Protein backbone atom coordinates (compact mmCIF):
# COMPACT_ATOMS: atom_id res chain seq x y z
CA UNK A 1 0.00 0.00 0.00
CA UNK A 2 0.95 3.68 0.06
CA UNK A 3 3.97 4.14 2.32
CA UNK A 4 3.30 7.88 2.45
CA UNK A 5 1.46 8.49 5.75
CA UNK A 6 -2.27 9.13 5.59
CA UNK A 7 -3.43 12.55 6.72
CA UNK A 8 -4.45 12.64 10.38
CA UNK A 9 -5.69 16.24 10.16
CA UNK A 10 -9.23 15.08 11.03
CA UNK A 11 -8.56 11.93 13.07
CA UNK A 12 -6.01 13.15 15.62
CA UNK A 13 -7.57 16.55 16.54
CA UNK A 14 -11.10 15.15 16.81
CA UNK A 15 -9.88 12.18 18.86
CA UNK A 16 -7.80 14.27 21.27
CA UNK A 17 -10.37 17.07 21.68
CA UNK A 18 -13.15 14.54 22.30
CA UNK A 19 -10.98 12.81 24.90
CA UNK A 20 -10.22 16.09 26.68
CA UNK A 21 -13.87 17.23 26.60
CA UNK A 22 -15.02 13.89 28.03
CA UNK A 23 -12.38 14.14 30.75
CA UNK A 24 -13.52 17.68 31.60
CA UNK A 25 -17.17 16.59 31.79
CA UNK A 26 -16.33 13.60 33.99
CA UNK A 27 -14.20 15.78 36.28
CA UNK A 28 -17.13 18.17 36.59
CA UNK A 29 -19.64 15.43 37.40
CA UNK A 30 -17.53 13.26 39.72
CA UNK A 31 -14.42 15.01 41.09
CA UNK A 32 -14.33 17.20 44.19
CA UNK A 33 -11.52 19.06 45.92
CA UNK A 34 -10.15 18.58 49.50
CA UNK A 35 -1.32 21.51 56.07
CA UNK A 36 1.99 21.20 57.92
CA UNK A 37 3.66 18.77 55.52
CA UNK A 38 2.00 19.96 52.31
CA UNK A 39 5.33 20.62 50.57
CA UNK A 40 6.87 17.38 51.85
CA UNK A 41 3.97 15.35 50.46
CA UNK A 42 4.01 17.33 47.21
CA UNK A 43 7.70 16.49 46.76
CA UNK A 44 7.09 12.74 46.31
CA UNK A 45 4.51 13.23 43.56
CA UNK A 46 6.76 15.84 41.99
CA UNK A 47 9.62 13.32 41.96
CA UNK A 48 7.32 10.81 40.25
CA UNK A 49 6.37 13.49 37.71
CA UNK A 50 10.03 14.24 36.96
CA UNK A 51 10.71 10.52 36.57
CA UNK A 52 7.73 10.12 34.23
CA UNK A 53 8.06 13.15 31.96
CA UNK A 54 11.84 13.60 31.92
CA UNK A 55 13.18 10.16 32.86
CA UNK A 56 11.01 7.84 30.78
CA UNK A 57 10.47 10.59 28.21
CA UNK A 58 14.14 10.87 27.32
CA UNK A 59 15.17 7.27 28.12
CA UNK A 60 13.58 6.15 24.84
CA UNK A 61 14.93 9.10 22.83
CA UNK A 62 18.06 7.10 21.88
CA UNK A 63 16.61 6.45 18.41
CA UNK A 64 18.42 8.08 15.49
CA UNK A 65 15.33 9.73 13.99
CA UNK A 66 12.63 9.25 16.65
CA UNK A 67 13.75 11.43 19.58
CA UNK A 68 11.09 14.12 18.99
CA UNK A 69 8.28 11.57 18.96
CA UNK A 70 9.63 9.72 22.00
CA UNK A 71 9.81 12.84 24.17
CA UNK A 72 6.60 14.53 22.99
CA UNK A 73 4.48 11.37 22.88
CA UNK A 74 5.64 10.50 26.39
CA UNK A 75 4.52 13.97 27.52
CA UNK A 76 1.13 13.52 25.83
CA UNK A 77 0.71 10.03 27.28
CA UNK A 78 1.50 11.24 30.80
CA UNK A 79 -0.94 14.15 30.51
CA UNK A 80 -3.77 11.88 29.33
CA UNK A 81 -2.95 9.04 31.70
CA UNK A 82 -2.89 11.06 34.91
CA UNK A 83 -6.40 12.44 34.29
CA UNK A 84 -7.84 9.09 33.24
CA UNK A 85 -6.15 7.33 36.17
CA UNK A 86 -7.58 9.91 38.60
CA UNK A 87 -11.08 9.18 37.31
CA UNK A 88 -10.66 5.41 37.17
CA UNK A 89 -9.00 5.04 40.58
CA UNK A 90 -11.92 7.11 41.82
CA UNK A 91 -14.48 4.82 40.21
CA UNK A 92 -12.96 1.45 41.17
CA UNK A 93 -12.06 2.25 44.80
CA UNK A 94 -15.29 3.79 46.11
CA UNK A 95 -17.37 11.01 44.59
CA UNK A 96 -13.74 11.31 43.50
CA UNK A 97 -11.76 13.32 46.05
CA UNK A 98 -8.65 14.91 44.55
CA UNK A 99 -5.68 15.09 46.91
CA UNK A 100 -1.95 15.19 46.27
CA UNK A 101 -1.78 11.51 47.22
CA UNK A 102 -4.36 10.65 44.55
CA UNK A 103 -2.39 12.65 41.97
CA UNK A 104 0.74 10.76 43.03
CA UNK A 105 -1.05 7.43 42.58
CA UNK A 106 -2.42 8.50 39.20
CA UNK A 107 1.13 9.42 38.22
CA UNK A 108 2.25 5.90 39.18
CA UNK A 109 -0.53 4.42 37.05
CA UNK A 110 0.53 6.63 34.13
CA UNK A 111 4.16 5.57 34.65
CA UNK A 112 3.02 1.98 34.13
CA UNK A 113 1.82 2.97 30.64
CA UNK A 114 4.98 4.99 30.04
CA UNK A 115 7.11 1.94 30.83
CA UNK A 116 4.97 -0.28 28.59
CA UNK A 117 5.14 2.17 25.67
CA UNK A 118 8.91 1.75 25.35
CA UNK A 119 8.28 -1.64 23.75
CA UNK A 120 6.04 -0.07 21.07
CA UNK A 121 7.53 3.42 20.61
CA UNK A 122 8.70 4.00 17.06
CA UNK A 123 6.04 1.66 15.65
CA UNK A 124 2.80 3.51 16.53
CA UNK A 125 1.22 6.92 16.03
CA UNK A 126 -0.44 9.15 18.61
CA UNK A 127 -3.96 7.69 18.31
CA UNK A 128 -2.71 4.15 18.96
CA UNK A 129 -0.85 5.50 21.98
CA UNK A 130 -4.10 7.08 23.22
CA UNK A 131 -5.81 3.70 22.93
CA UNK A 132 -2.90 2.05 24.72
CA UNK A 133 -3.00 4.61 27.55
CA UNK A 134 -6.74 4.20 28.10
CA UNK A 135 -6.83 0.40 27.92
CA UNK A 136 -3.67 -0.09 29.99
CA UNK A 137 -4.83 2.23 32.78
CA UNK A 138 -8.18 0.42 32.74
CA UNK A 139 -6.48 -2.98 32.89
CA UNK A 140 -4.19 -1.97 35.76
CA UNK A 141 -7.14 -0.59 37.72
CA UNK A 142 -9.15 -3.75 37.03
CA UNK A 143 -6.22 -5.91 38.15
CA UNK A 144 -5.91 -3.92 41.38
CA UNK A 145 -9.66 -4.17 42.02
CA UNK A 146 -9.64 -7.94 41.41
CA UNK A 147 -6.70 -8.38 43.79
CA UNK A 148 -8.41 -6.21 46.41
CA UNK A 149 -11.59 -8.27 46.12
CA UNK A 150 -9.92 -11.70 46.20
CA UNK A 151 -6.95 -11.30 48.56
CA UNK A 152 -8.59 -8.56 50.68
CA UNK A 153 -5.74 -6.06 50.28
CA UNK A 154 -6.07 -2.32 49.77
CA UNK A 155 -6.73 -1.13 46.22
CA UNK A 156 -3.92 1.44 46.35
CA UNK A 157 -1.41 -0.98 47.89
CA UNK A 158 -2.01 -3.36 44.97
CA UNK A 159 -0.14 -0.87 42.74
CA UNK A 160 3.12 -2.55 43.78
CA UNK A 161 2.66 -5.00 40.86
CA UNK A 162 3.14 -2.18 38.36
CA UNK A 163 6.67 -3.11 37.25
CA UNK A 164 5.74 -6.61 36.11
CA UNK A 165 2.34 -5.54 34.77
CA UNK A 166 3.92 -2.80 32.64
CA UNK A 167 6.70 -5.08 31.39
CA UNK A 168 4.42 -7.92 30.30
CA UNK A 169 1.74 -5.60 28.88
CA UNK A 170 4.33 -3.83 26.75
CA UNK A 171 5.82 -7.14 25.63
CA UNK A 172 2.42 -8.45 24.53
CA UNK A 173 1.42 -5.26 22.71
CA UNK A 174 4.78 -5.17 20.92
CA UNK A 175 4.38 -8.84 20.00
CA UNK A 176 1.02 -8.08 18.39
CA UNK A 177 2.40 -5.32 16.13
CA UNK A 178 3.52 -5.82 12.51
CA UNK A 179 7.19 -6.74 12.17
CA UNK A 180 9.81 -4.21 10.88
CA UNK A 181 19.68 2.80 14.83
CA UNK A 182 21.35 5.02 17.44
CA UNK A 183 23.16 8.35 17.35
CA UNK A 184 25.52 10.03 19.78
CA UNK A 185 23.51 13.14 20.75
CA UNK A 186 20.23 11.20 21.24
CA UNK A 187 22.24 8.68 23.28
CA UNK A 188 23.47 11.48 25.54
CA UNK A 189 19.91 12.80 25.94
CA UNK A 190 18.83 9.25 26.79
CA UNK A 191 21.63 9.15 29.36
CA UNK A 192 20.13 12.31 30.87
CA UNK A 193 16.75 10.59 31.12
CA UNK A 194 18.28 7.42 32.54
CA UNK A 195 20.23 9.40 35.14
CA UNK A 196 17.10 11.20 36.31
CA UNK A 197 15.25 7.86 36.55
CA UNK A 198 18.15 6.28 38.46
CA UNK A 199 18.50 9.25 40.80
CA UNK A 200 14.83 9.52 41.74
CA UNK A 201 13.86 5.82 41.73
CA UNK A 202 13.92 5.72 45.58
CA UNK A 203 10.73 7.78 45.27
CA UNK A 204 9.15 5.05 43.10
CA UNK A 205 9.87 2.48 45.81
CA UNK A 206 8.18 4.45 48.61
CA UNK A 207 5.14 6.54 47.51
CA UNK A 208 2.67 4.05 48.98
CA UNK A 209 4.40 3.68 52.37
CA UNK A 210 2.91 5.68 55.23
CA UNK A 211 5.19 4.84 58.16
CA UNK A 212 8.26 7.12 58.12
CA UNK A 213 10.71 4.37 59.12
CA UNK A 214 9.40 2.17 56.30
CA UNK A 215 9.97 4.93 53.74
CA UNK A 216 13.42 5.56 55.21
CA UNK A 217 14.49 1.92 54.89
CA UNK A 218 12.94 1.62 51.43
CA UNK A 219 14.86 4.64 50.12
CA UNK A 220 18.07 3.40 51.77
CA UNK A 221 17.73 -0.04 50.18
CA UNK A 222 16.84 1.40 46.78
CA UNK A 223 19.76 3.84 46.87
CA UNK A 224 22.36 1.20 47.77
CA UNK A 225 20.89 -1.42 45.40
CA UNK A 226 20.92 1.11 42.56
CA UNK A 227 24.54 2.07 43.25
CA UNK A 228 25.65 -1.57 43.19
CA UNK A 229 23.58 -2.19 40.05
CA UNK A 230 25.14 0.76 38.22
CA UNK A 231 28.62 -0.54 38.96
CA UNK A 232 27.74 -4.11 37.95
CA UNK A 233 25.97 -3.02 34.75
CA UNK A 234 28.68 -0.66 33.50
CA UNK A 235 31.40 -3.20 34.20
CA UNK A 236 29.61 -6.26 32.83
CA UNK A 237 28.38 -4.57 29.66
CA UNK A 238 31.72 -5.47 28.04
CA UNK A 239 31.20 -9.20 28.69
CA UNK A 240 27.68 -9.13 27.19
CA UNK A 241 28.71 -7.39 23.97
CA UNK A 242 30.20 -9.05 20.87
CA UNK A 243 32.96 -6.44 20.44
CA UNK A 244 33.67 -6.25 24.20
CA UNK A 245 32.79 -2.55 24.47
CA UNK A 246 30.42 -0.84 26.89
CA UNK A 247 27.00 -0.25 25.33
CA UNK A 248 25.16 2.99 26.14
CA UNK A 249 21.80 1.40 25.30
CA UNK A 250 22.44 -1.52 27.66
CA UNK A 251 23.52 0.85 30.45
CA UNK A 252 20.39 3.00 30.08
CA UNK A 253 18.19 0.02 30.92
CA UNK A 254 20.48 -1.87 33.29
CA UNK A 255 21.12 1.00 35.73
CA UNK A 256 17.55 0.53 36.99
CA UNK A 257 18.21 -3.15 37.78
CA UNK A 258 18.63 -2.90 41.55
CA UNK A 259 15.72 -0.50 41.91
CA UNK A 260 13.44 -2.92 40.08
CA UNK A 261 14.83 -5.92 41.98
CA UNK A 262 14.24 -4.44 45.45
CA UNK A 263 11.12 -2.49 44.46
CA UNK A 264 8.58 -4.82 46.06
CA UNK A 265 10.78 -5.72 49.04
CA UNK A 266 12.73 -2.53 49.87
CA UNK A 267 10.71 -1.83 53.02
CA UNK A 268 11.24 -5.42 54.21
CA UNK A 269 15.04 -5.69 53.78
CA UNK A 270 16.54 -5.03 57.24
CA UNK A 271 20.20 -4.27 56.40
CA UNK A 272 21.88 -2.45 53.49
CA UNK A 273 24.13 -5.43 52.68
CA UNK A 274 21.13 -7.51 51.61
CA UNK A 275 19.91 -4.71 49.34
CA UNK A 276 23.42 -4.52 47.87
CA UNK A 277 23.46 -8.30 47.35
CA UNK A 278 20.14 -8.06 45.52
CA UNK A 279 21.46 -5.19 43.40
CA UNK A 280 24.55 -7.20 42.47
CA UNK A 281 22.47 -10.26 41.58
CA UNK A 282 20.13 -8.07 39.51
CA UNK A 283 23.11 -6.62 37.64
CA UNK A 284 24.48 -10.09 36.94
CA UNK A 285 21.07 -11.24 35.69
CA UNK A 286 20.94 -8.13 33.50
CA UNK A 287 24.32 -9.06 31.99
CA UNK A 288 23.12 -12.62 31.39
CA UNK A 289 19.88 -11.39 29.87
CA UNK A 290 21.77 -9.13 27.49
CA UNK A 291 24.01 -12.05 26.52
CA UNK A 292 21.20 -14.61 26.13
CA UNK A 293 17.77 -13.10 25.36
CA UNK A 294 18.49 -12.01 21.73
CA UNK A 295 19.41 -15.64 21.03
CA UNK A 296 16.04 -16.79 22.40
CA UNK A 297 11.55 -7.54 20.04
CA UNK A 298 13.04 -5.06 22.51
CA UNK A 299 15.77 -6.76 24.54
CA UNK A 300 15.68 -4.12 27.29
CA UNK A 301 11.98 -4.71 27.95
CA UNK A 302 12.65 -8.45 28.03
CA UNK A 303 15.35 -8.03 30.67
CA UNK A 304 13.04 -5.63 32.55
CA UNK A 305 10.39 -8.38 32.53
CA UNK A 306 12.94 -10.85 33.90
CA UNK A 307 13.98 -8.32 36.56
CA UNK A 308 10.39 -7.68 37.63
CA UNK A 309 9.77 -11.41 37.93
CA UNK A 310 12.96 -11.67 40.00
CA UNK A 311 11.73 -8.84 42.23
CA UNK A 312 8.47 -10.64 42.89
CA UNK A 313 10.35 -13.90 43.54
CA UNK A 314 12.68 -12.27 46.07
CA UNK A 315 9.63 -10.67 47.67
CA UNK A 316 8.21 -14.19 48.04
CA UNK A 317 11.49 -15.43 49.54
CA UNK A 318 11.78 -12.52 52.00
CA UNK A 319 8.10 -12.48 53.03
CA UNK A 320 8.36 -15.98 54.52
CA UNK A 321 11.13 -14.87 56.89
CA UNK A 322 9.14 -11.82 58.01
CA UNK A 323 3.33 -22.01 53.61
CA UNK A 324 -0.13 -20.73 52.73
CA UNK A 325 1.06 -17.15 52.18
CA UNK A 326 3.50 -18.50 49.59
CA UNK A 327 0.59 -20.01 47.64
CA UNK A 328 -1.48 -16.83 47.98
CA UNK A 329 1.37 -14.59 46.79
CA UNK A 330 2.22 -16.91 43.89
CA UNK A 331 -1.47 -16.73 42.99
CA UNK A 332 -1.44 -12.93 43.11
CA UNK A 333 1.64 -12.84 40.88
CA UNK A 334 0.14 -15.30 38.38
CA UNK A 335 -3.15 -13.39 38.26
CA UNK A 336 -1.17 -10.22 37.55
CA UNK A 337 0.74 -11.90 34.71
CA UNK A 338 -2.41 -13.46 33.23
CA UNK A 339 -4.33 -10.18 33.27
CA UNK A 340 -1.34 -8.28 31.85
CA UNK A 341 -0.98 -10.78 29.00
CA UNK A 342 -4.70 -10.85 28.17
CA UNK A 343 -5.08 -7.06 28.24
CA UNK A 344 -1.92 -6.65 26.17
CA UNK A 345 -3.38 -9.04 23.60
CA UNK A 346 -6.63 -7.07 23.51
CA UNK A 347 -4.70 -3.81 23.10
CA UNK A 348 -2.59 -5.34 20.34
CA UNK A 349 -5.58 -6.44 18.28
CA UNK A 350 -7.14 -3.02 18.87
CA UNK A 351 -3.99 -1.27 17.63
CA UNK A 352 -3.95 -3.37 14.44
CA UNK A 353 -7.21 -1.81 13.21
CA UNK A 354 -6.96 0.05 9.91
CA UNK A 355 -8.79 3.10 11.31
CA UNK A 356 -5.78 4.24 13.35
CA UNK A 357 -3.71 4.94 10.19
CA UNK A 358 -0.62 3.30 11.66
CA UNK A 359 2.73 4.02 9.99
CA UNK A 360 3.89 1.60 7.32
CA UNK A 361 6.39 -0.97 8.57
CA UNK A 362 8.99 0.64 6.30
CA UNK A 363 8.38 3.96 8.09
CA UNK A 364 9.07 2.86 11.68
CA UNK A 365 11.36 4.84 14.01
CA UNK A 366 11.06 8.03 11.95
CA UNK A 367 9.90 11.48 13.06
CA UNK A 368 9.03 12.59 9.51
CA UNK A 369 5.96 10.34 9.72
CA UNK A 370 4.43 12.50 12.47
CA UNK A 371 6.22 15.87 12.45
CA UNK A 372 6.56 18.88 10.18
CA UNK A 373 9.92 19.31 8.48
CA UNK A 374 10.98 22.00 5.99
CA UNK A 375 11.77 21.55 2.29
CA UNK A 376 9.53 18.48 1.99
CA UNK A 377 6.99 17.73 -0.70
CA UNK A 378 3.56 17.57 0.94
CA UNK A 379 0.46 15.93 -0.49
CA UNK A 380 -0.28 14.70 -3.98
Amino acid sequence: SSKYPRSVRRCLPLWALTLEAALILLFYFFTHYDQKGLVASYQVGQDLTVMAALGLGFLTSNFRRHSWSSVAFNLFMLALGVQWAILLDGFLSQKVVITLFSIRLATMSAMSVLISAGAVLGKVNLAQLVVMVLVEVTALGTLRMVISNIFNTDYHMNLRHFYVFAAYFGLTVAWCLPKPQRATIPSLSAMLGALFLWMFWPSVNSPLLRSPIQRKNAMFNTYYALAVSVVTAISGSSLAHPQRKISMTYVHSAVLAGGVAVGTSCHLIPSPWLAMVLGLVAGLISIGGAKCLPVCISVMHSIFSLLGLLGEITYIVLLVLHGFQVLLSIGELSLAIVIALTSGLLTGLLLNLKIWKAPHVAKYFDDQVFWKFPHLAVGF
Binding site: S1, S2, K3, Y4, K363, H375
Partner: protein, 157 residues
Protein backbone atom coordinates in the same frame (compact mmCIF):
# COMPACT_ATOMS: atom_id res chain seq x y z
CA UNK B 1 -21.57 9.68 -10.31
CA UNK B 2 -20.09 7.34 -12.92
CA UNK B 3 -16.82 9.28 -12.83
CA UNK B 4 -16.83 9.16 -9.02
CA UNK B 5 -17.41 5.40 -9.07
CA UNK B 6 -14.62 4.95 -11.63
CA UNK B 7 -12.22 6.97 -9.47
CA UNK B 8 -13.23 4.98 -6.38
CA UNK B 9 -12.57 1.75 -8.28
CA UNK B 10 -9.18 3.19 -9.26
CA UNK B 11 -8.40 4.03 -5.63
CA UNK B 12 -9.57 0.66 -4.29
CA UNK B 13 -7.91 -1.48 -6.96
CA UNK B 14 -11.19 -2.83 -8.35
CA UNK B 15 -9.98 -3.22 -11.93
CA UNK B 16 -13.06 -5.15 -13.12
CA UNK B 17 -15.54 -2.51 -11.94
CA UNK B 18 -13.47 0.31 -13.45
CA UNK B 19 -13.14 -1.54 -16.76
CA UNK B 20 -16.91 -2.06 -16.79
CA UNK B 21 -17.35 1.67 -16.15
CA UNK B 22 -14.95 2.50 -19.00
CA UNK B 23 -16.92 0.17 -21.28
CA UNK B 24 -20.10 1.98 -20.21
CA UNK B 25 -18.57 5.26 -21.46
CA UNK B 26 -16.70 6.86 -18.53
CA UNK B 27 -14.06 9.34 -19.68
CA UNK B 28 -10.45 8.23 -19.27
CA UNK B 29 -9.15 11.67 -18.25
CA UNK B 30 -11.65 12.55 -15.52
CA UNK B 31 -10.09 13.71 -12.26
CA UNK B 32 -11.22 14.35 -8.69
CA UNK B 33 -11.42 17.68 -6.86
CA UNK B 34 -7.65 17.64 -6.28
CA UNK B 35 -6.86 16.94 -9.94
CA UNK B 36 -5.98 13.27 -9.42
CA UNK B 37 -7.23 11.14 -12.31
CA UNK B 38 -7.49 7.35 -12.24
CA UNK B 39 -3.82 6.88 -13.06
CA UNK B 40 -2.89 9.18 -10.17
CA UNK B 41 -4.96 7.21 -7.65
CA UNK B 42 -3.78 3.86 -9.03
CA UNK B 43 -0.17 5.03 -8.74
CA UNK B 44 -0.87 6.27 -5.20
CA UNK B 45 -2.28 2.91 -4.09
CA UNK B 46 0.19 0.81 -6.09
CA UNK B 47 -2.22 -0.97 -8.47
CA UNK B 48 0.08 -1.98 -11.33
CA UNK B 49 -2.65 -3.93 -13.11
CA UNK B 50 -4.79 -0.78 -13.08
CA UNK B 51 -1.85 1.36 -14.24
CA UNK B 52 -1.17 -1.00 -17.16
CA UNK B 53 -4.85 -1.19 -18.13
CA UNK B 54 -5.26 2.60 -17.97
CA UNK B 55 -2.14 3.17 -20.07
CA UNK B 56 -3.45 0.63 -22.59
CA UNK B 57 -6.72 2.59 -22.79
CA UNK B 58 -4.87 5.73 -23.99
CA UNK B 59 -4.80 7.66 -20.72
CA UNK B 60 -2.57 10.73 -20.72
CA UNK B 61 0.67 9.87 -18.96
CA UNK B 62 2.12 13.35 -18.33
CA UNK B 63 -1.00 14.93 -16.80
CA UNK B 64 -0.54 16.84 -13.54
CA UNK B 65 -2.56 17.61 -10.44
CA UNK B 66 -3.00 21.13 -9.06
CA UNK B 67 0.22 20.61 -7.10
CA UNK B 68 1.94 19.84 -10.42
CA UNK B 69 2.56 16.15 -9.71
CA UNK B 70 2.56 13.52 -12.44
CA UNK B 71 1.83 9.84 -11.83
CA UNK B 72 5.58 9.28 -11.47
CA UNK B 73 5.72 11.99 -8.78
CA UNK B 74 2.92 10.29 -6.86
CA UNK B 75 4.41 6.81 -7.26
CA UNK B 76 7.80 8.09 -6.09
CA UNK B 77 6.35 9.86 -3.04
CA UNK B 78 4.22 6.83 -2.15
CA UNK B 79 7.17 4.46 -2.57
CA UNK B 80 5.43 2.16 -5.07
CA UNK B 81 8.55 0.89 -6.82
CA UNK B 82 6.70 -1.53 -9.09
CA UNK B 83 4.36 1.27 -10.20
CA UNK B 84 7.45 3.46 -10.73
CA UNK B 85 9.01 0.76 -12.92
CA UNK B 86 5.80 0.39 -14.93
CA UNK B 87 5.46 4.15 -15.45
CA UNK B 88 9.08 4.53 -16.57
CA UNK B 89 8.74 1.49 -18.85
CA UNK B 90 5.80 3.28 -20.49
CA UNK B 91 7.87 6.44 -21.02
CA UNK B 92 7.38 8.57 -17.92
CA UNK B 93 9.45 11.74 -17.74
CA UNK B 94 11.79 11.04 -14.81
CA UNK B 95 12.83 14.71 -14.66
CA UNK B 96 9.37 16.29 -14.46
CA UNK B 97 9.12 19.17 -12.01
CA UNK B 98 6.11 20.14 -9.91
CA UNK B 99 4.94 23.68 -9.16
CA UNK B 100 7.41 23.97 -6.28
CA UNK B 101 10.14 22.31 -8.38
CA UNK B 102 10.23 18.81 -6.88
CA UNK B 103 11.35 15.92 -9.06
CA UNK B 104 10.42 12.25 -8.59
CA UNK B 105 13.99 11.68 -7.41
CA UNK B 106 13.56 14.42 -4.80
CA UNK B 107 10.31 12.86 -3.58
CA UNK B 108 11.90 9.41 -3.36
CA UNK B 109 14.94 10.81 -1.53
CA UNK B 110 12.87 12.78 0.99
CA UNK B 111 10.85 9.67 1.88
CA UNK B 112 13.81 7.24 2.21
CA UNK B 113 12.65 5.11 -0.74
CA UNK B 114 16.07 3.67 -1.53
CA UNK B 115 15.10 1.28 -4.32
CA UNK B 116 12.99 3.98 -6.01
CA UNK B 117 16.03 6.28 -5.84
CA UNK B 118 18.12 3.45 -7.30
CA UNK B 119 15.77 2.93 -10.24
CA UNK B 120 15.37 6.65 -10.95
CA UNK B 121 19.14 7.18 -10.91
CA UNK B 122 19.59 4.16 -13.19
CA UNK B 123 16.99 5.71 -15.53
CA UNK B 124 18.71 9.08 -15.93
CA UNK B 125 17.20 11.17 -13.13
CA UNK B 126 19.20 14.37 -12.65
CA UNK B 127 20.20 14.75 -9.00
CA UNK B 128 21.28 18.35 -9.61
CA UNK B 129 17.83 19.79 -10.38
CA UNK B 130 17.12 21.95 -7.34
CA UNK B 131 13.73 23.07 -6.07
CA UNK B 132 12.42 26.60 -5.70
CA UNK B 133 14.00 26.63 -2.23
CA UNK B 134 17.30 25.52 -3.77
CA UNK B 135 17.28 22.01 -2.28
CA UNK B 136 18.56 18.90 -4.05
CA UNK B 137 17.66 15.26 -3.37
CA UNK B 138 21.06 15.03 -1.67
CA UNK B 139 20.26 17.99 0.60
CA UNK B 140 16.82 16.71 1.59
CA UNK B 141 18.25 13.24 2.26
CA UNK B 142 20.98 14.76 4.45
CA UNK B 143 18.43 16.86 6.36
CA UNK B 144 16.16 13.88 7.06
CA UNK B 145 19.06 11.54 7.88
CA UNK B 146 18.31 9.11 5.05
CA UNK B 147 21.90 7.86 5.14
CA UNK B 148 21.51 5.07 2.58
CA UNK B 149 19.92 7.50 0.13
CA UNK B 150 22.82 9.92 0.74
CA UNK B 151 25.34 7.11 0.23
CA UNK B 152 23.80 5.93 -3.03
CA UNK B 153 23.38 9.49 -4.32
CA UNK B 154 27.06 10.26 -3.77
CA UNK B 155 28.12 6.85 -5.09
CA UNK B 156 26.14 7.19 -8.32
CA UNK B 157 27.12 10.85 -8.65
Amino acid sequence: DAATSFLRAARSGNLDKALDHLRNGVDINTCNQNGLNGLHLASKEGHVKMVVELLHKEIILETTTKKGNTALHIAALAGQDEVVRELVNYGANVNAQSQKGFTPLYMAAQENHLEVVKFLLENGANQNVATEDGFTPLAVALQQGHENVVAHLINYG
